[PDB]
Paper text:
The Hsh49p–Cus1(290–368)p construct yielded small needle-like trigonal crystals, which diffracted to a maximum resolution of 2.7 Å, but at this point we were unable to solve the structure by molecular replacement or isomorphous replacement, partly due to twinning. In RRM2, the β2/β3 loop is disordered and density for one residue is missing from the linker between β4 and the C-terminal extension. This C-terminal extension of RRM2 (186–205) forms an α-helix, which folds back and wedges between RRM1 and RRM2, interacting with RRM1 via the β1/α1 and α2/β4 loops and more extensively with the longer β2/β3 loop. In addition, there is an interaction between the β-sheet face of RRM1 and a symmetry related Cus1(290–368)p in the Hsh49p–Cus1(290–368)p crystals.
Hsh49p, comprising two RRMs, forms a heterodimer with Cus1p. The structures show that the Cus1 fragment binds to the α-helical surface of Hsh49p RRM1, opposite the four-stranded β-sheet, leaving the canonical RNA-binding surface available to bind RNA. Hsh49p binds the 5′ end region of U2 snRNA via RRM1.
Numbering used by the authors:
A (entry chain B): 289 to 350
B (entry chain A): 8 to 86, 106 to 144, 147 to 185, 187 to 205
Amino acid sequence: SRPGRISQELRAIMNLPEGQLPPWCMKMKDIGLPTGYPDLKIAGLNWDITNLKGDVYGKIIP
Amino acid sequence: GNTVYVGNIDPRITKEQLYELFIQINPVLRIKYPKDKVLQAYQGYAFIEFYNQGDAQYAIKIMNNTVRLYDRLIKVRQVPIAKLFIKNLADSIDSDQLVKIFNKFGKLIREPEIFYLSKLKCAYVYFEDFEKADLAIKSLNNQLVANNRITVDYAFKNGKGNAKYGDDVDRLLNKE
C-alpha cells in the first residue's frame, strides 16, 4: 500500500465513487501538500487528471 | 507531539485499513488500535503515531472532519454521546430547570444549550448514556412541563441512537 492508491474496499467504506478525488485533496489546495511527501503528485492539483484511474489518484514522482 | 487521537471509528474498520487511510496523509510509524477483550471488537478510537510533530499537526489540519468511514465522520485531535432535541419549552424553563428535569434520569456530560426556531424555544440535552437517554424520552416525550407540551427525541447528527452506539457502551466500560 502506497500514498496515492486507495483499494476498492476502502473506497466503498469511504463512499467515494470512481473518478473522484478523496475528500482530503480539496483541503490540500488551501493548506498545502503533505509535509512527509514533498514529491506527491495528485491528479487535478499538480498531475494531469488523465492519471486518475482505478485505485490511483496520485503518486510520489520527483 | 507526534501522535494523534482518532475518534468515531466504526468497529468494522480494521487496522490495515487505518494504515491504508492515514499513509495518504503522511508516513506512519505505528498504530495503537485497542480491542475490547470480552467482546473481541474494536472500541471506536485509535492512536496514530507519525514520525515528528509537524506531520502530526499536518494530519490534524487535513483529516479533521473530512473523511466519512461507513458514513460516520472521523475526528482527529492531538495528545459518542446521547444528544436529545427538546422542542416547545416554556419561557419559564431555565437552563437550570432542564438540568433538574433530566438529572433524575441520568448523568449529563455538559450543560444544556438553548435555542429558538421559527417563537419556538428548544434545547439540546447531552446524556452520558443512551440507556438513560431512553428513559428520559419515554417519560417526557409528549408531556406537559410548565403548561407547555414538549417533544423529546434524539437529535440529528441521520439520527443519534443508532446501533453502532455500542461505542457508548465501550466508552462507559473504559471510563471515557
